[PDB]
Amino acid sequence: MVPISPIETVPVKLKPGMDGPKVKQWPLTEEKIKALVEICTEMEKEGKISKIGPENPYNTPVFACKKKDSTKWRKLVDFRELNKRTQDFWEVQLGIPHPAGLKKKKSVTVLDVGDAYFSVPLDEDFRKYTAFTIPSINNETPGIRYQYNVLPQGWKGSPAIFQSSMTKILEPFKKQNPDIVIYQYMDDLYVGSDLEIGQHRTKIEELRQHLLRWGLTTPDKKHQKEPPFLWMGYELHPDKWTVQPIVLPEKDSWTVNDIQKLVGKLNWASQIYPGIKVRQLSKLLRGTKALTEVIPLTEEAELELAENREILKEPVHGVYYDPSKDLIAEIQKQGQGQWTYQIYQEPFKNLKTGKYARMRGAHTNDVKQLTEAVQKITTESIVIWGKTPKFKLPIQKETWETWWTEYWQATWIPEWEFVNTPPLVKLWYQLEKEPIVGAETFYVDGAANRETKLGKAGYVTNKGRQKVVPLTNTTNQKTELQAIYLALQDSGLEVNIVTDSQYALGIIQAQPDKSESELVNQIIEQLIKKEKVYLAWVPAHKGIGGNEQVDKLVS
Amino acid sequence: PIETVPVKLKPGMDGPKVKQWPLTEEKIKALVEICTEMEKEGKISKIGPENPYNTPVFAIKKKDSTKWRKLVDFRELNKRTQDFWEVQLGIPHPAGLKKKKSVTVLDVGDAYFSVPLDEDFRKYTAFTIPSINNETPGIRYQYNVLPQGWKGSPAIFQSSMTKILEPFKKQNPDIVIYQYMDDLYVGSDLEIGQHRTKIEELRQHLLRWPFLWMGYELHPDKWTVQPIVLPEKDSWTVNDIQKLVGKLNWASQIYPGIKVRQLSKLLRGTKALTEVIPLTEEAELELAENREILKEPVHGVYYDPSKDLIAEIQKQGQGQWTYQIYQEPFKNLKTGKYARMRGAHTNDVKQLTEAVQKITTESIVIWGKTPKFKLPIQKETWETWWTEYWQATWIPEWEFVNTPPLVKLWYQ
DNA sequence: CAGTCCCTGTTCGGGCGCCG
DNA sequence: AACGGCGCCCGAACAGGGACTG
Numbered sequence A: 001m002v003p004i005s006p007i008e009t010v011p012v013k014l015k016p017g018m019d020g021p022k023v024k025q026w027p028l029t030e031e032k033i034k035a036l037v038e039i040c041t042e043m044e045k046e047g048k049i050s051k052i053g054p055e056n057p058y059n060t061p062v063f064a065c066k067k068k069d070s071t072k073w074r075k076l077v078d079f080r081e082l083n084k085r086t087q088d089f090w091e092v093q094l095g096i097p098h099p100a101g102l103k104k105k106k107s108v109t110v111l112d113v114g115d116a117y118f119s120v121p122l123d124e125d126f127r128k129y130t131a132f133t134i135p136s137i138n139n140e141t142p143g144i145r146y147q148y149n150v151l152p153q154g155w156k157g158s159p160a161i162f163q164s165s166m167t168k169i170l171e172p173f174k175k176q177n178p179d180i181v182i183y184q185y186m187d188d189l190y191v192g193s194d195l196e197i198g199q200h201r202t203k204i205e206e207l208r209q210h211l212l213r214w215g216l217t218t219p220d221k222k223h224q225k226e227p228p229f230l231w232m233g234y235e236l237h238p239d240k241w242t243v244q245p246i247v248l249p250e251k252d253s254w255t256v257n258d259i260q261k262l263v264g265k266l267n268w269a270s271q272i273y274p275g276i277k278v279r280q281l282s283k284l285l286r287g288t289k290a291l292t293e294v295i296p297l298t299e300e301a302e303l304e305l306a307e308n309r310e311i312l313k314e315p316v317h318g319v320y321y322d323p324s325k326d327l328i329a330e331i332q333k334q335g336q337g338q339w340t341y342q343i344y345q346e347p348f349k350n351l352k353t354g355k356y357a358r359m360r361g362a363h364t365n366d367v368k369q370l371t372e373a374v375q376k377i378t379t380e381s382i383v384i385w386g387k388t389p390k391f392k393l394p395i396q397k398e399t400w401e402t403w404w405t406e407y408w409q410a411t412w413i414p415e416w417e418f419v420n421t422p423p424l425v426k427l428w429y430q431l432e433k434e435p436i437v438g439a440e441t442f443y444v445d446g447a448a449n450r451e452t453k454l455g456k457a458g459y460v461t462n463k464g465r466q467k468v469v470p471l472t473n474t475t476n477q478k479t480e481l482q483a484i485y486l487a488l489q490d491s492g493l494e495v496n497i498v499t500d501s502q503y504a505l506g507i508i509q510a511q512p513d514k515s516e517s518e519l520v521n522q523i524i525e526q527l528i529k530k531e532k533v534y535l536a537w538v539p540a541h542k543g544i545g546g547n548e549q550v551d552k553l554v555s
Numbered sequence B: 001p002i003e004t005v006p007v008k009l010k011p012g013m014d015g016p017k018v019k020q021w022p023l024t025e026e027k028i029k030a031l032v033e034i035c036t037e038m039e040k041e042g043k044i045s046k047i048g049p050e051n052p053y054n055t056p057v058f059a060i061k062k063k064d065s066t067k068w069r070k071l072v073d074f075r076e077l078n079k080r081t082q083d084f085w086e087v088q089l090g091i092p093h094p095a096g097l098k099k100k101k102s103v104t105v106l107d108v109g110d111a112y113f114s115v116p117l118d119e120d121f122r123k124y125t126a127f128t129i130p131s132i133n134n135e136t137p138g139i140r141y142q143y144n145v146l147p148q149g150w151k152g153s154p155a156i157f158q159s160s161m162t163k164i165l166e167p168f169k170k171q172n173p174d175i176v177i178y179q180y181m182d183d184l185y186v187g188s189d190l191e192i193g194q195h196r197t198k199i200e201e202l203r204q205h206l207l208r209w210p211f212l213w214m215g216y217e218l219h220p221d222k223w224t225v226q227p228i229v230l231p232e233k234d235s236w237t238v239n240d241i242q243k244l245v246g247k248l249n250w251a252s253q254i255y256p257g258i259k260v261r262q263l264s265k266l267l268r269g270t271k272a273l274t275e276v277i278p279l280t281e282e283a284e285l286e287l288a289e290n291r292e293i294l295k296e297p298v299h300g301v302y303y304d305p306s307k308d309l310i311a312e313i314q315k316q317g318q319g320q321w322t323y324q325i326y327q328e329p330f331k332n333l334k335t336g337k338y339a340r341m342r343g344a345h346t347n348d349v350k351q352l353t354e355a356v357q358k359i360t361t362e363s364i365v366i367w368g369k370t371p372k373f374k375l376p377i378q379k380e381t382w383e384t385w386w387t388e389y390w391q392a393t394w395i396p397e398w399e400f401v402n403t404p405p406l407v408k409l410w411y412q
Numbered sequence C: 001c002a003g004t005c006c007c008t009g010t011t012c013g014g015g016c017g018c019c020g
Numbered sequence D: 001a002a003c004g005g006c007g008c009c010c011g012a013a014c015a016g017g018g019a020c021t022g
């Protein structure tokens, strides 16, 4: 006979055709034994845990770990086998709140529900599926087995049930206090208002007593009444916010798992520290698949790591969101496919920063990557503030106009303005739209044998110029690119090039300025040196123009 | 007082589990206000995290409308109940709707809120309202009545709809009425004054039983086709003929009688691209014959009601967008071109969005199906902006392609 | 006409950061 | 040695289209 808590229960079922967990316990140290027998006895008197007998043919091992910055221990249940047989839940936590999205509030209070999961009940018909034994001695007393009447920590349904139960309890209080903002993330509650400090504490105590009606306690241990508030890993001040101190390891010998932690903290630091790069550091995590393998730092990875540490020396901070002012996002090119950006409302008062350095596609250009950076910033801004910022981009309006009007794919950038901060983003060459009068016409082609991997590439021109180059360990696609490279090498500043390669033409028409292929990069270098290039395509094996003639040479 | 029509998913398929995407501030504030009223009216109810199903939701404004409309992306739930709105209770498509002079589209989705939904099926209509900056967890609901945007709603309401439209159809035997999703397509050959008058009579016929006041007008008799055309120049260069033979060779996949023998003979040798080549007597004959074949209709091209419709779109530049609707490759049921749409010369995504909506509207009128689109755009570009410009209450399927223009086939 | 290859794209799962 | 959320950068597995070979 246990009392039913005021919180409405959540009906939890299991996957059909499956039963409950039947896993043997794990032999643990005697230190954990004297730290769980006292918990199951206290929770038994408080109605949070009931004792069972032989009528419960289930069992689940448990373990305990020390809480961070607290004398109290934390109890966890290894429900990994129960999660495989429990119904799937749709998570109501859609993201992580960011302090740059917080508005200016006169008074701020951060609460913390004590015994979060241990205050929300479990489904009545589901408590039987949570069986676990607790031996008081490591090899003497068999230990009476208990069960759970609340949410266990470690179960895959505990977070979603708590987050949904907490919302239903706060819904009536928020309806009575519309002007009070309550950021609800797990058990921690961020409460802010524009009321006076005296009147603010009055509503805080009203909320503390409101939650107490459902058995939710807000102890004075984690009650924050004055800045700086530690919320979501940040330091919240009345007019600014900053990330909690980030410590980077400094080892003499670096391994794989050390760089993974190093790059991770730099990603977390790049949200407010402008100009952080992890290109050369992450480049060391390629190929090697041994987390305990020493990797020497390259000169590029060492200079990148040195510049990041100096950025973290000077203390930086972000500001809060003012809906009355516009959102501004400015991007800078950092080179090697690296982009950094700042989002702000007042000049030099950054709400947050960030970086985009994803390299998608074997061939691309700075305009494509700038477009991808804008899209990432847009979605990020819609998550945090619910609107798109006005962009300040290092690309001329004329350059952008030339690109998107002539590109075959739909592409667009929201309302933006040009900012003249080098390096400017530009197109490094422009393919002509019509054939060039007076320019030598090169008919290029390439063929390769599938078996021997041998091939040829060359050209014939209207002036009689001709070349055939034998190639070893190549492909049909490479010889077509090689043929175009030959025509660019052996032509004047203006040249018309005729190819039948849909592959090669498709790459070059997209005006790439960088490539994972050394051959394409050489072609790009030649295209930049030219003054006029016209690429034309004809179908292969049709007796068209000189394409038929060069086809005989390379095949 | 209405027995809930039992609805079952297709055998071997679970409910939809699609993540909600971020919403702008004005859309969240619109959906919160709409869902609060619907919950007060009992149309929807809040649910918990024990419902593992979810469907995206956002809000739109129709053309020239300042009122928000709740739009649910039921595309996943629809194709998981396909044997219902197509096999059990299907709606016949009238072939005469596309022949009418004027066709008005009426939003009748609000009538579906009067019929209850099967209790065992309400769990599949779950959606989640997000919050700005994740201030609060997601606010989950499920539908208690027939939801807008679900293909099962017009199927179940069809029995009720027929009784309502029965007196009007007897009054006007020449008017063709077709129902698709939340819309009602009303076509007639009457004059513009007579047509709009009869549309208002149908509106009053529905009132005696929030977007019924709107009426998007169509004119399928004015819809045009964009055939393949060949350039007509006074002089031809090597480059011109090389492009012509490449275009005709690709066109041979559609018209088998197209020849390029006499035209390829003009390119014998290794000539400069800008060299002017006069057309021989046989080349003029072969080019003139190919122009007539492009006017002839393609053999063995007809609509198969059991096959899906496919729509490809090409960005031609300067506000020009071409498209082809087909079920089998090179068997185009329709080819057209759009020009100077909204967003022309400034926004590719708004134009592409408009083109997709226009093509879908045509496909609903002609065949009663929405095609699956092959969009010439990057996935991330489309998924960032398309909801900003969507003005329809349905959503077609789409995929993303990248085909460089080796030869301008549909627009020289 | 199939069956491959070459090439390039997306998807996903795990590594890390961080929150509770 | 547990659960859920989000972000990044990584690689293996998979899909799809031109193009060549039997």
Ligand SMILES: Cc1cn([C@H]2C=C[C@@H](COP(=O)(O)OP(=O)(O)OP(=O)(O)O)O2)c(=O)[nH]c1=O
Pocket: A112, A113, A114, A115, A116, A117, A153, A154, A186, A187, C020, D003
């Ligand atoms: C940090 C953490 C948390 N949780 C779950 C459990 C309760 C909520 C909040 O955890 P908590 O605030 O740190 O501890 P809590 O149970 O609330 O008890 P108190 O320390 O607040 O008194 O999230 C978890 O399952 N694993 C974890 O590692």
Ligand SMILES: [Mg+2]
Pocket: A112, A113, A114, A115, A116, A187, A188
């Ligand atoms: Mg707590």
Ligand SMILES: [Mg+2]
Pocket: A445, A446, A480, A500, A501, A540
């Ligand atoms: Mg070739």
